[PDB]
Design a protein around this ligand. Structure first.
Ligand SMILES: *[C@@H]1O[C@H](CO)[C@@H](O[C@@H]2O[C@H](CO)[C@@H](O[C@@H]3O[C@H](CO)[C@@H](O)[C@H](O[C@H]4O[C@H](CO)[C@@H](O)[C@H](O)[C@@H]4O)[C@@H]3O)[C@H](O)[C@H]2NC(C)=O)[C@H](O)[C@H]1NC(C)=O
Ligand SMILES: *[C@@H]1O[C@H](CO)[C@@H](O[C@@H]2O[C@H](CO)[C@@H](O[C@@H]3O[C@H](CO[C@H]4O[C@H](CO)[C@@H](O)[C@H](O)[C@@H]4O)[C@@H](O)[C@H](O)[C@@H]3O)[C@H](O)[C@H]2NC(C)=O)[C@H](O)[C@H]1NC(C)=O
Ligand SMILES: *[C@@H]1O[C@H](CO)[C@@H](O[C@@H]2O[C@H](CO)[C@@H](O[C@@H]3O[C@H](CO)[C@@H](O)[C@H](O)[C@@H]3O)[C@H](O)[C@H]2NC(C)=O)[C@H](O)[C@H]1NC(C)=O
Ligand SMILES: *[C@@H]1O[C@H](CO)[C@@H](O[C@@H]2O[C@H](CO)[C@@H](O[C@@H]3O[C@H](CO)[C@@H](O)[C@H](O)[C@@H]3O)[C@H](O)[C@H]2NC(C)=O)[C@H](O)[C@H]1NC(C)=O
Ligand SMILES: *[C@@H]1O[C@H](CO)[C@@H](O[C@@H]2O[C@H](CO)[C@@H](O)[C@H](O)[C@H]2NC(C)=O)[C@H](O)[C@H]1NC(C)=O
Ligand SMILES: *[C@@H]1O[C@H](CO)[C@@H](O[C@@H]2O[C@H](CO)[C@@H](O)[C@H](O)[C@H]2NC(C)=O)[C@H](O)[C@H]1NC(C)=O
Ligand SMILES: *[C@@H]1O[C@H](CO)[C@@H](O)[C@H](O)[C@H]1NC(C)=O
Ligand SMILES: *[C@@H]1O[C@H](CO)[C@@H](O)[C@H](O)[C@H]1NC(C)=O
Ligand SMILES: *[C@@H]1O[C@H](CO)[C@@H](O)[C@H](O)[C@H]1NC(C)=O
Ligand SMILES: *[C@@H]1O[C@H](CO)[C@@H](O)[C@H](O)[C@H]1NC(C)=O
Ligand SMILES: *[C@@H]1O[C@H](CO)[C@@H](O)[C@H](O)[C@H]1NC(C)=O
Ligand SMILES: *[C@@H]1O[C@H](CO)[C@@H](O)[C@H](O)[C@H]1NC(C)=O
Lengths: 171, 317, 317, 171, 321, 172
């Protein structure tokens, strides 16, 4: 994708994450763990539902039309009737092909974008108390118990609290 | 003594391939199908009024072929003509059959109003063994085969004004005998003529005497014609022989009505979209079942499958 | 003691809704309308040459119905036919009326060139009280009702070659008497025939005798036909009765001309695009006013509004 | 949008900014103030004008066509004439709907992108003399009088001048 | 004293302009053309079977105009009619010419099967000096001009059932004499009639007596009609004068066959797509050569050029020159 | 473009780079030099080839159709035949115009994106041993011989090795 997170600097996805689309894996003092990020999962799903509902908008209801199958050869009028229908079908077939291609490229790019957005939001939360390893992971330069991890995940991490400790571990 | 916080995204063991602008195949976590490619095989009887023609074409029901009498005064949203349908009355042709079939199908009704035409000095209600009605000879219910009275067929000159506020459809015909013997025996005069006119149009038909291929015993034929009479206008029928007279008019409507050729059986279920293969669901925007449709239908396309990605790119491990 | 530097973007108190790939409604700072949905109610008289038909259809002006004589040799980019138009001459029909109307409309002119046809042994310039001219009876200006001279109507056989570099349109007709009495009284022979041909094609018409509803005093009718003769080709007319002869040809052009049904008044103003509802501006790419248009027009669509976002997403305070 | 600035990490827009589309709010020693960024405002407007002028390119001039309204019932030929027109209108109506949807999604994304571009240009100007608070605002770690703010805004801020001062205030 | 690491991208001396959503002209490193705008001027003779009509329209080859006899039983994927084609037989018209031409073109064959029609009490094989076949008078090869035998033209009543499993196309006609003298001299009766019928349909034509323009010596004409007879159906022809009888039927097919008007010469080469201007390559998705095409063709569009960017945006170093 | 690298913070392209689409220019102890980045060059080319092959997918073959040129004036039927063809051609002409415009905008944006991706990959490799000058260039704050540059380019640069040296050169 355009943002280079999914199938980019994040080497691969997590089959083990089944309660969300994006999220967090940590290793700290107290062991390892995993949590879904709800907000970014919701943003992606909401955008995808939005486009799904636009595509499946019932928009044509047709009643009496032209004949499209013929049991007798007739010539000129029938040639035109067939050509009109074959023209129509080709144009709609093209619309359908283009639509999915554009939609799918865009879906891949917005999902890549939501990953990247979560990664930057997190980096900005951690200020100078952490460093981007370049593979989707932050090395945090202070003691971060399970309470501290949940604080990063649930949006309440005050960086000033750990800053002096972390600045010294870095430099 | 630090900690590591990794950001990531889900994956699944078995993703689906989709197309994009840049790749004809690329794997995503999930997708949904946009082309309806299957049908029940059955035409749902709601919410549209389906009228199964069974053994009858719309035109045979219009004219009133005896095995089609059950369709008298019927209405429909969709009339369904079956490949087993047959004619069993006087052999006939309709110049511009396709148009008559279309306009009737579209009107959505066979509602017929008998009018008191006065046919002075001819015999009414002619019948043929090719068109049995009960045990004896008969004819199309909505047409009146006129023949000589005693030894004369006078000039017929009749009028029927339209003093209603709706259009009237009149169906009428001309008889084409096989021999001169038959012509003069039925109509006295050696050459018939049928002239049907309004203020705004006229059609004059000269019958054609000669053999055609034998159909249900007969080398003669009837040709069917139609005339619409608008409010304030007037029908005039003028003939010195060979007239197959109307008995009245059909009431015309406009609306959602149509006709479809299909052998799919009718079932008790609910479907907005009908094809000749049967009803199809209309939740998807496209369909590959049949280009012939009626109702709220997906648009017909040539592709049998198109997948809309409903998730991110799948990168397993 | 530091400083804070905040980045941001504008907003407005009341934005506009637009549609996107993901949202049916999302609010942006500004948008512009792409569907023209209103009209003045008036057809602008520039830059296209508008010809108001007033009481006349194009066909009545073509044939030369007396109240339409003012249209002789009139030209147009767009001929405008009005719902009040009426016919007031010999009652007639045109098989394939729609085509004749189309090709004349498209030629953009009624310019007529009289040709010296030689009708040997018939009376010319027949008239009817159904088509009054001055105190007496009259006829279509561009047609020549031919009847017997003394007690004979000979075989008429005339030729008119096209040695010009433009197409010639010939308008002619066939007379349908109401009785045999009138057929023989006018044309001697009991059955007329009109055959009009060029090198590669031909039309042959048999008249139809019979009674029709009264129009302007008459039960009889004329049927109108046309023949186009290309450069280097030749017209032949052959008839032993019932010919309504041409007096000449209409000179054909090709170009931008057309015809429209409308009751909108014509006004002094400038509009490239004309609809029956009146002129509309063409600054927008789409329009919902009418699918019938003439000129440089937006394309007709079903939506009455479509907004193109002309600014960012609006997130007010 | 795809970049997550507008309706993302920037909580909301500024109704009070009426001389530009993007810009700057500051608090320093000498008080508060506001200025539009002309370059980013221009880039967005210019792109939007470009696409507007492509969409309103006059491209359709038609003269004699088919009849589209009929006073008499005719059958086959009229069915075809109507079906041709109804096919056409549906295809153009679809084109119009798709066009606006693609254009509008793209307009939202390019405006979001211009915001993000201005934010990164600024971050890069400030080198190590400032920190991203994560809400669209930079905390500058030195004395920045009104002359210094205008230097950031008008593109002339030499970071080396304030670096020692700022490095010490940070660490 | 450290080091500087600069990231960058290429540029080229001569880029190309393309269109985008936001710009009608913007420069990229490379692009490729999506509209085919040229042709060789020549119709390639493979892989489709091309039949050059030379001096003959399909209809003249159908009817069997003597200079078109070489086309007897021919087949084609594409029949090519030339602007030099001419008729040289009895002057004729075809009501609904366009349809007959279409259905024959589409059938892709002129394969003809003679049938033993029994014309009792008339003279067969009439000929005209307007339709020379070798030195003497002649007629269309697939039609049989019937005239009186002695001093009578009886009512003709003949049948030909279709007991095959394919459709039969019958071509027949009606003769329109110029004078009553000619009518009665050829057909005895003062007024002819031709009725051709199957089970569900019938055509009746009354001839019309009168002059038409002089063509190859004649002011008379023949009008051509057709009737298709399906398997199990039956042809009946009934006439008391003026019948131009069929000698048989043409076998109908369905397939990829068509017809095209073109003066492009046919050449030895391979092209899937054929236009009247000549063959064109089909590697590009669009073309501006001709809206008339046959085969695997790019779709016709009005633009003569459309450029697809095949590289990045091209940004040269700005110069002070 | 949407990412602001090409014709953005990178002032211009390099005519002198002829063995790749993206890459590296360095100035160190031992002089100046240039190398193409193969991976980013390949990603862009592969995406562009992918879209080219989708657009040129041969997908219509038509045989007998309607007549489109006429030698006689006929009226109603011919008007409809012409109108059908003119409708078709306009719709396909529009499809073609839109297609290139969307494709080309997207091509410009993906090439801009690949530049930006390479710039961020590099920034992340260099951790705290370098600084973004803001013009596409990193100032590296340590001795980086030609072996060290190739290590950055070929993906093997261990930042921990030079970190102490670099951290001290950065902060004073
Ligand atoms: C009905 O009206 C038309 C018009 O009066 C009439 O048709 C014309 O008849 C004449 C005489 O048959 C035709 O003359 C021919 O003209 C062509 C030139 O285009 C010449 O090639 C011909 O020349 C040879 O044949 C003549 C034998 O008749 C010789 O006299 C002559 O020296 C040459 O050998 C020939 O002169 C004329 O073309 C037609 N015109 C048209 C438009 O048809 C028709 O005959 C009339 N019908 C009746 C029953 O009177
Ligand atoms: C075959 O049948 C036809 C109908 O019976 C015959 O036509 C009728 O013929 C008579 C005279 O021969 C006509 O009488 C004239 O009519 C006008 C009025 O005409 C209309 O206008 C008024 C309003 O202005 C309207 O209210 C009426 O309803 C009419 O529609 C009278 O005022 C005169 O007195 C005049 O004599 C009939 O109009 C006419 N009817 C129709 C429907 O044509 C026809 O003659 C018969 N043919 C033969 C050969 O016998
Ligand atoms: C004109 O030619 C045709 C063929 O020669 C004649 O039509 C044929 O008429 C006979 C009866 O006269 C039909 O035969 C019947 O067949 C049924 C079974 O199908 C049989 O049960 C009856 O007893 C009877 O024999 C025959 O089908 C019919 N042929 C066709 C092809 O329709 C016609 O009579 C001739 N007319 C004149 C006036 O010469
Ligand atoms: C930039 O894009 C253009 C397309 O506009 C490229 O030009 C094309 O290059 C190829 C060769 O690389 C040519 O195709 C080949 O043609 C030969 C004979 O000419 C044939 O034997 C091969 O099988 C193959 O089809 C093509 O002719 C040429 N087209 C044009 C119009 O120049 C160009 O190479 C691209 N440049 C770069 C640097 O990528
Ligand atoms: C629906 O019915 C149509 C018409 O009978 C089916 O199309 C036929 O079936 C196969 C191809 O699937 C061909 O051999 C025939 O020639 C087809 N006819 C036509 C007119 O296309 C169609 O396949 C059916 N589809 C479904 C999903 O039931
Ligand atoms: C292919 O032939 C077409 C049709 O013959 C050419 O277009 C015609 O060219 C004339 C000029 O000689 C134009 O004024 C006409 O408008 C065109 N006619 C039609 C019917 O469109 C076309 O230029 C030729 N193209 C090539 C590449 O040879
Ligand atoms: C978020 O994190 C803390 C620490 O785990 C928790 O106790 C708290 O209840 C959570 N959120 C809020 C808004 O209090
Ligand atoms: C795909 O579609 C829906 C979720 O929208 C769900 O029922 C189904 O399980 C999904 N499949 C996978 C593999 O995620
Ligand atoms: C047909 O229409 C009406 C009923 O509304 C009535 O005049 C007539 O008797 C009806 N006949 C039949 C058989 O339904
Ligand atoms: C909205 O956009 C259009 C075109 O860009 C412009 O004419 C109009 O003035 C704008 N409206 C406002 C309120 O800026
Ligand atoms: C234009 O005229 C048509 C037909 O009379 C009508 O249905 C339509 O709503 C009118 N629209 C406007 C905007 O005037
Ligand atoms: C045409 O083909 C048929 C059989 O396929 C044959 O009987 C007939 O003689 C053929 N004629 C020519 C000229 O090849």
């Amino acid at each position: 994708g355009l943002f280079g997170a999914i199938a980019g600097f994040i080497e691969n996805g997590w089959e083990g994450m089944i309660d969300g689309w994006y999220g967090f894996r940590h290793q700290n003092s107290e062991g390892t763990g995993q949590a879904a990020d709800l907000k970014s999962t919701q943003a992606a799903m909401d955008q995808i539902n939005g486009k799904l509902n636009r595509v499946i908008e019932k928009t044509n209801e047709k009643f009496h039309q032209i004949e499209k199958e013929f049991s007798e050869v007739e010539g000129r009028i029938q040639d035109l009737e067939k050509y009109v229908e074959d023209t129509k079908i080709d144009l709609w077939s093209y619309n359908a092909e283009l639509l999915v291609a554009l939609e799918n490229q865009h879906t891949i790019d917005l999902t890549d974008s939501e990953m990247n957005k979560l990664f930057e939001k997190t980096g900005r939360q951690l200020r100078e108390n952490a460093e981007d390893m370049g593979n989707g992971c932050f090395k945090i330069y202070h003691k971060c118990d399970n309470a501290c991890i949940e604080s990063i995940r649930n949006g309440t991490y005050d960086h000033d609290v750990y800053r002096d400790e972390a600045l010294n571990n870095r430099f | 003594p630090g900690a590591t916080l990794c950001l990531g995204h889900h994956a699944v063991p078995n993703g689906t391939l989709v197309k994009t602008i840049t790749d004809d195949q690329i794997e995503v976590t999930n997708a949904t199908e946009l082309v309806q490619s299957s049908s029940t095989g059955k035409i749902c009887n709601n919410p549209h009024r389906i009228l199964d023609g069974i053994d009858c074409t719309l035109i045979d029901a219009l004219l009133g072929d005896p095995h089609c009498d059950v369709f008298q005064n019927e209405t429909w949203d969709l009339f369904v003509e079956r490949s087993k349908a047959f004619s069993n009355c006087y052999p006939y042709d309709v110049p511009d059959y396709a148009s008559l079939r279309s306009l009737v199908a579209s009107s959505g009704t066979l509602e017929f109003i008998t009018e008191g035409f006065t046919w002075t000095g001819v015999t009414q209600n002619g019948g043929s063994n090719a068109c049995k009605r009960g045990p004896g000879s008969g004819f199309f219910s909505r047409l009146n085969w006129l023949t000589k009275s005693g030894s004369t067929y006078p000039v017929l000159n009749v009028t029927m004004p339209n003093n209603d506020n709706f259009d009237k459809l009149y169906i009428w015909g001309v008889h084409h005998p096989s021999t001169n013997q038959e012509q003069t025996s039925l109509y006295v005069q050696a050459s018939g003529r049928v002239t049907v006119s309004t203020r705004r149009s006229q059609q004059t038909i000269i019958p054609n005497i000669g053999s055609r291929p034998w159909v249900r015993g007969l080398s003669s034929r009837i040709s069917i014609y139609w005339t619409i009479v608008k409010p304030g206008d007037v029908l005039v029928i003028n003939s010195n022989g060979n007239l197959i007279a109307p008995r009245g008019y059909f009431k015309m409507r406009t609306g959602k009505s149509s006709i479809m050729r299909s052998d799919a059986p009718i079932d008790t279920c609910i479907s907005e979209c009908i094809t000749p293969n049967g009803s199809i669901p209309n939740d998807k925007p496209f369909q590959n079942v049949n280009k012939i449709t009626y109702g709220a239908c997906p648009k017909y396309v040539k592709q049998n499958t198109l997948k809309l990605a409903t998730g991110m790119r799948n990168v397993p491990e």
